[PDB]
Amino acid sequence: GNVDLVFLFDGSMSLQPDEFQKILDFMKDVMKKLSNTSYQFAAVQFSTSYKTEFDFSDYVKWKDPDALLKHVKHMLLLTNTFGAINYVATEVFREELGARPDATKVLIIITDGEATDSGNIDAAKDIIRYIIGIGKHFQTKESQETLHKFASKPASEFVKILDTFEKLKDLFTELQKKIYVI
Ligand SMILES: CC[C@H](C)C(=O)O[C@H]1C[C@@H](C)C=C2C=C[C@H](C)[C@H](CC[C@H]3C[C@@H](O)CC(=O)N3Cc3ccc4c(CO)c(OC)ccc4c3)[C@H]21
Ligand SMILES: [Mg+2]
């Protein structure tokens, strides 16, 4: 079916350059895998503030993950997840930017820390939300549970916790096994 998917990725100061690049490579792999489907993509970096790295219209003209993500600069600031989700819901899912009104709305959030802001995400309730929490800031189950509020229910489907950035390759292998394009 028609899916408008947005990647919302953390550019916080905690990320080393190879870790940040692993996030970027995961996004490129997913998009490569789903080229030729009727998925459309956008990507937003968040840290303290928010930047649309590419929107749906951009993806439809270029259709090239390497080109679309070539000029990403790592922000290196905080983790304002509440505001970032609201940015996606109000600034990214818009017909003017290539969003399709018939499409299922999916958001994938990739983060390595707890949120530094406060808010609510009512404006994003019609969006299916996955969150991928990576690394040492999610060793404890308290910290993992802070992510449940951002994800769709049940957290058992929509919250993924990865202990290292190397495990993003494993997560992609699971996607390759479960999604089947004919
Ligand atoms: C599928 C198994 C992998 C491990 C996974 O969870 O993928 C998630 C998380 C992350 C690793 C990467 C992803 C990359 C792309 C997909 C969006 C994928 C989830 C796909 C699908 C898995 C399903 O079990 C739960 C769900 O809500 N969706 C999203 C989705 C996709 C299409 C939908 C369509 C059109 O086919 C609908 O129209 C009938 C309705 C809902 C849809 C939901 C998502
Ligand atoms: Mg961080």
Curated annotation (Swiss-Prot):
Subcellular localization: Cell membrane
Name the record gives this protein: Integrin alpha-L
Domain notes: The integrin I-domain (insert) is a VWFA domain. Integrins with I-domains do not undergo protease cleavage. The I-domain is necessary and sufficient for interaction with ICAM1 and F11R.
Known tissue expression: Leukocytes.
Family per similarity comment: Belongs to the integrin alpha chain family.
Changes after translation: In resting T-cells, up to 40% of surface ITGAL is constitutively phosphorylated. Phosphorylation causes conformational changes needed for ligand binding and is necessary for activation by some physiological agents.
Subunit details: Heterodimer of an alpha and a beta subunit. The ITGAL alpha subunit associates with the ITGB2 beta subunit. Interacts with THBD. Interacts with CD226. (Microbial infection) Interacts with SARS-CoV Orf7a protein.
Native source organism of the sequence: Homo sapiens (Human)
